C-alpha cells in the first residue's frame, strides 16, 4: 500500500478527467491518517468539487425543467422529472456525506493547533459541502444543514482573521464562499455585501503583502469578490 502511487493515480485520473477515480484515490490517501500536503489537499478538493459539481449542475437543469413542465400540467411527465430530480439529489447527498465524513473524522481531526492554513481550508470545505446540501434541502432538514454550514464558515473566518494576512488566497476564497452563502442561502444580501467588501478592502490596504507566489491567485479571487459585489448592487 503505497501512498505515492495513490497520489500518482490521482494526478493521472485528473488528467484523464475521471473524477470518481481521482476522488477514490485521494479518499484512500486521506484514510492513511497522515496529514495532506498542499498539493494533496488541492487534489482532494478538485476531485470532490467535480464529482459533486456535475450533480449540482444536473440538478439545476432538471429543477429548471421541472418548473416549466410542472406549470404545463402533465402528471405522468411531472412524476418522472421529479423522480429523476430525486435520484440526482440522493447521489449529490451521498457525495457530500462522504466528503464530510473525511473532513470530520480524518482531516480536521488531525490538524494541530499551528496548522492554521489547513484548519481554515478544511473548515471552508465543510461549509461548502453543507451549503451544497442546503441548495437541495427543504423544511427542517434545510434548517439543520444551513446551521452546520454557518458554524463551519464562522469558525474558519475566526481562525483566518486571527492568523492569516488579508491577501492570503485561502482567506480570500473563504470570504468569497461565505459571502455567497450569506446571499444565496441565508438571503441576507446586506451581510453578504459587507463581508465581500470588507475582505476586498482589507486585501487592497495590505496589497504589498503579496508574494509573487500568491499575486495571481489572490488578485483573481479579488476580481471574483468585486464581480459578486457589482452583481449584488
Amino acid at each position: 500500500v503505497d501512498r505515492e502511487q495513490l497520489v500518482q493515480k490521482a494526478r493521472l485520473a485528473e488528467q484523464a478527467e475521471r473524477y470518481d477515480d481521482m476522488a477514490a484515490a485521494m479518499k484512500n490517501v486521506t484514510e492513511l491518517n497522515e496529514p495532506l500536503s498542499n498539493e494533496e489537499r488541492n487534489l482532494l478538493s478538485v476531485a470532490y468539487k467535480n464529482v459533486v459539481g456535475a450533480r449540482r449542475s444536473s440538478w439545476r437543469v432538471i429543477s429548471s425543467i421541472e418548473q416549466k413542465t410542472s406549470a404545463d400540467g402533465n402528471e405522468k411527465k411531472i412524476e418522472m422529472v421529479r423522480a429523476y430530480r430525486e435520484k440526482i439529489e440522493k447521489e449529490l447527498e451521498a457525495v457530500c456525506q462522504d466528503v464530510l465524513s473525511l473532513l470530520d473524522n480524518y482531516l480536521i481531526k488531525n490538524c494541530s493547533e499551528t496548522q492554521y492554513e489547513s484548519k481554515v481550508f478544511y473548515l471552508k470545505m465543510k461549509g461548502d459541502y453543507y451549503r451544497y446540501l442546503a441548495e437541495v434541502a427543504t423544511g427542517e432538514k434545510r434548517a439543520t444543514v444551513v446551521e452546520s454550514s454557518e458554524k463551519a464558515y464562522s469558525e474558519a473566518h475566526e481562525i483566518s482573521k486571527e492568523h492569516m494576512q488579508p491577501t492570503h488566497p485561502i482567506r480570500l476564497g473563504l470570504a468569497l464562499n461565505y459571502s455567497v452563502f450569506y446571499y444565496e442561502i441565508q438571503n441576507a444580501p446586506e451581510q453578504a455585501c459587507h463581508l465581500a467588501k470588507t475582505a476586498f478592502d482589507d486585501a487592497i490596504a495590505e496589497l504589498d503583502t503579496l508574494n509573487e507566489d500568491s499575486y495571481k491567485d489572490s488578485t483573481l479571487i479579488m476580481q471574483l469578490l468585486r464581480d459578486n459585489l457589482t452583481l449584488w448592487t
Binding site: 476564497g173 468569497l176 464562499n177 455567497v180 479571487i221 471574483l224 464581480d227 459578486n228 452583481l231 449584488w232
Partner: peptide, 6 residues
C-alpha cells in the same frame, strides 16, 4: 448567479 471559488 453569484460565483463561488472555482
Amino acid at each position: 448567479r453569484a460565483i463561488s471559488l472555482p
